[PDB]
């Protein structure tokens, strides 16, 4: 008697990793760096017309 | 504590188009007449 239970097949998915600076909603926002903004009560922002 | 208070402005070129005559410098002037020959 000849017999075996075998194993065939295995298969992942791609995990896209999709920045933020690629889509058209990147248009709308100017997204800056600032640390700290957390110790802040106030960094607000004055402007004239 | 940020920046952006600054906005632009000017109007000109339509802004002699339409007014389609200028006579300027009137001085201390009292009557102006023009007068039609037809």
Do not use: H, I
Not at 29 to 49: D, H, I, S, W
């Amino acid at each position: 008697d000849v017999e075996f239970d075998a194993l065939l097949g295995s298969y992942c998915n791609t995990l896209s990793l999709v920045r933020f600076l690629e889509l058209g909603l990147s248009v709308a926002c100017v997204c800056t760096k600032f640390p700290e903004l957390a110790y802040m009560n106030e960094g607000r922002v004055q402007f004239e017309v």
